[PDB]
Design a protein around this ligand. Structure first.
Ligand code: MET
Length: 243
C-alpha cells in the first residue's frame, strides 16, 4: 500500500526533523544565552563603577572584543563609549537606537531583530541590557553580533545534506538566512501561494522549483523575543534517502 508506506516514511522523517530542530534550537539558545549573560555581566560591573577610565578598560577586555564586533555603553545623558574604536556618524544619539529602546522597553536583557547599523549602514543584531543602580537606569550596554555568525551556529549540523536552517520571528519575518537575499523578507513574500504556518508542525511548500518541508521550533531562554528555528528540507531528497 503506497499510502501506508508514504506515511511510514513521513513519520520517520518528521521524527528525525523534530530531533534536529530541538537540538539546533537548544544550540542557538545556549549560544545566544552566553552572549546575553556576558552583556548582563558587563552592565552590572558598570553599575558599580562607570568612570570613563573604567568604562574604557572594561570594554577593551578581550573576552568582550573577541566575542562581539563592538561592545558599548550609551548613557542616559547621551554619552557613548564603544570598543574597538570606530569613526562616528554625525548626529548619533544612542538613546534613539533600536538596541537602547528595546532594552529600556524590555526592562532587562534582550536581543534586537536585525537593524541598520548607524556607522556601517549594514544589518546587525545586538544583545542589550539596561544598567541599573538603585532603581535608576544609567544607560544601556550593547553587544553587536553579525548575522553571518548566527547562520553558522544554526547550520553547524548538515542535516544529512537534506537542507538548511534559518531564523524567523513569530510574525513571520526571516531574521538570518544562508541566502542573504531572503534576510528580512517574510514567509509570505518567499512563499506567496501556500505560505508555511509557524504554528503547524510540518508544512510543504515550493521554493525555486523544488518541494520543501518546513518545520519550526521555538527557541527558549530569549527574553522579550519570540523567535523560531526553521528547518527547510528538500522533500524529494529526504524521501529518497530514507527509502
Ligand atoms: C555607533 S554605530 C554602532 C553601534 C550600534 N550597532 C548602532 O547602530 O547604534
Amino acid at each position: 500500500n503506497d499510502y501506508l508506506q508514504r506515511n511510514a516514511i513521513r513519520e520517520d522523517l518528521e521524527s528525525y526533523l523534530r530531533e534536529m530542530g530541538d537540538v539546533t534550537s537548544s544550540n542557538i539558545q545556549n549560544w545566544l544565552g552566553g552572549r546575553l549573560l556576558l552583556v548582563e555581566q558587563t552592565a552590572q560591573t558598570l553599575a558599580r563603577d562607570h568612570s570613563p577610565e573604567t568604562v574604557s578598560a572594561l570594554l577593551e577586555q578581550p573576552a568582550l572584543t573577541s566575542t562581539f564586533s563592538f561592545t558599548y555603553l550609551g548613557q542616559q545623558d547621551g554619552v557613548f563609549t564603544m570598543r574597538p574604536d570606530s569613526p562616528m556618524p554625525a548626529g548619533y544619539d544612542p538613546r534613539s537606537r533600536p538596541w537602547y529602546k528595546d532594552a529600556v522597553a524590555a526592562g532587562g536583557l534582550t536581543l534586537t531583530e536585525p537593524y541598520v547599523d548607524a556607522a556601517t549602514q549594514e544589518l546587525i543584531i545586538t544583545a542589550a541590557t539596561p544598567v541599573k543602580a538603585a532603581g535608576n537606569t544609567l544607560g544601556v550596554v550593547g553587544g553587536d553580533l553579525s548575522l553571518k555568525t548566527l547562520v553558522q551556529i544554526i547550520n553547524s549540523l548538515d542535516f544529512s545534506g537534506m537542507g538548511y536552517a534559518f531564523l524567523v520571528s513569530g510574525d513571520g519575518k526571516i531574521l538570518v538566512h544562508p541566502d542573504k537575499e531572503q534576510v528580512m523578507k517574510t514567509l509570505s513574500e518567499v512563499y506567496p501561494q501556500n505560505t508555511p504556518k509557524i504554528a503547524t508542525g510540518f508544512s510543504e511548500a515550493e521554493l525555486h522549483g523544488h518541494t520543501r518541508i518546513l518545520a519550526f521550533t521555538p527557541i527558549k531562554g530569549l527574553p522579550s523575543v519570540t523567535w523560531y528555528l526553521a528547518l527547510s528540507i528538500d522533500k524529494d531528497k529526504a524521501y529518497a534517502m530514507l527509502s
